[PDB]
């Protein structure tokens, strides 16, 4: 009985938007890490045809920007990019304060810790590093990590049982503990490379996606397995609803939303295709982010637009 309806687009940057970040403390700003080497803060002014206006652009990255996050107080922003370095921004005119001279090759994902004290980055040079908040790395992990590119890396949202997960093109869902950065489980069962993982707001279950098309759920406490549900083509993004169930996934040029008590598809969200010339495959969706209240979802597409989806009825 619940449907999602798009209340307009956010235009304003020409590139593949690759990441959307939202904050719980101030629900009028979002971030857009895109492929034109910029990050955009938006004024979410709920209007007609003006649902968002760009408010400040953050530059300083040499090449494509891969990931972005927000601190718990919503004052600092951290972002990694394809020039092999991380960069800690802020509000109040958005000048970078610290930069993390890191991996040899380019990073793919960053993640704030639960207390905004530990900084982690997964990169294409097949290493993962945990960082101090002032710039210095504590120590990298090597020679038991993935033997392929380390894709998306996420922290467990709870301070209890500090857990960090790491997908990759090794087709493994390697999970590390924050006490000594040793391996604790070695999840196997994917058939292609992995694009992303996401941990639920309770630190109990995580979902992994990739070239398989299976949004393949896991468990964290007992950590053996859960049910696997398969949606469509290539899986780009995964995020759980913040207050509620209905995990969503970005599968090709459409996003599929699934409940968890029962495994039915809840809704199909597509852009309305106009002037079908049967030549160009439709623009994919590259990123998803809830607005920390479960009311609106921002979906980042592979053209230069990001769409907002609003719950109805």
């Amino acid at each position: 009985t619940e449907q999602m309806t798009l209340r307009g687009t956010l235009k304003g940057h020409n590139g593949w938007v690759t990441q959307i970040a939202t904050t719980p403390q101030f629900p009028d700003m979002i971030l857009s890490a895109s492929r034109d080497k910029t990050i955009i803060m938006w004024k979410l002014t709920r209007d007609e045809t003006n649902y968002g206006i760009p408010q400040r652009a953050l530059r300083g990255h040499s090449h494509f920007v891969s990931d972005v996050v927000i601190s718990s107080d919503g004052q600092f922003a951290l972002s990694g990019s394809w020039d092999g370095t991380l960069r800690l921004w802020d509000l109040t005119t958005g000048t970078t304060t610290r930069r993390f001279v890191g991996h040899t090759k380019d990073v793919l994902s960053v993640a704030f810790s639960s207390d905004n004290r530990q900084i982690v980055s997964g990169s294409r040079d097949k290493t993962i590093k945990l960082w101090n908040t002032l710039g210095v790395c504590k120590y990298t992990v090597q020679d038991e990590s993935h033997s392929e590119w380390v894709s998306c890396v996420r922290f467990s949202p709870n301070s209890s049982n500090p857990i960090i997960v790491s997908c990759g093109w090794d087709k493994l869902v390697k999970v590390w503990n924050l006490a000594n950065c040793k391996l604790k489980t070695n999840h196997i069962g994917h058939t292609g490379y992995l694009n992303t993982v996401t941990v639920s707001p309770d630190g109990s279950l995580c979902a992994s996606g990739g070239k398989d098309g299976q949004a393949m759920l896991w468990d964290l406490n007992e950590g053996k397995h859960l049910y696997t549900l398969d949606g469509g083509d290539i899986i780009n993004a995964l995020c759980f609803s913040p207050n509620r169930y209905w995990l969503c996934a970005a599968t090709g040029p459409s996003i599929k939303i699934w409940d968890l008590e029962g495994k039915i598809i809840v809704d199909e969200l597509k852009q309305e295709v106009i002037s079908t010339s049967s030549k160009a495959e439709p623009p994919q969706c590259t990123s998803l982010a809830w607005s920390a209240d479960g009311q609106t979802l921002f979906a980042g597409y592979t053209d230069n637009l990001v769409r907002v989806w609003q719950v109805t009825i």
Binding site: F64, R124, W169, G192, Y193, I234
Partner: protein, 68 residues
């Protein structure tokens, strides 16, 4: 005008597609990075010429059964 790819690019791209089809897609930059890290290509221009032809060939494969 004058953008024909030589047989070096074409046969390198064909062997790359044949061996590493699972890790490639229709995106030029990720294909560029994959071809960078799975093959010793001596120059950058040759590298991303090969990556461009790999992208074109994967669009062709996603349409239908070309060789292959």
């Amino acid at each position: 005008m004058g953008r024909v790819r030589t047989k070096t690019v074409k046969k390198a791209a064909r062997v790359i597609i044949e061996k590493y089809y699972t890790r490639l897609g229709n995106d030029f930059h990720t294909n560029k990075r994959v071809c960078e890290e799975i093959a010793i290509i001596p120059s950058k221009k040759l590298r991303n010429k090969i990556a461009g032809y790999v992208t074109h060939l994967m669009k062709r494969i996603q349409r239908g059964p070309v060789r292959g």
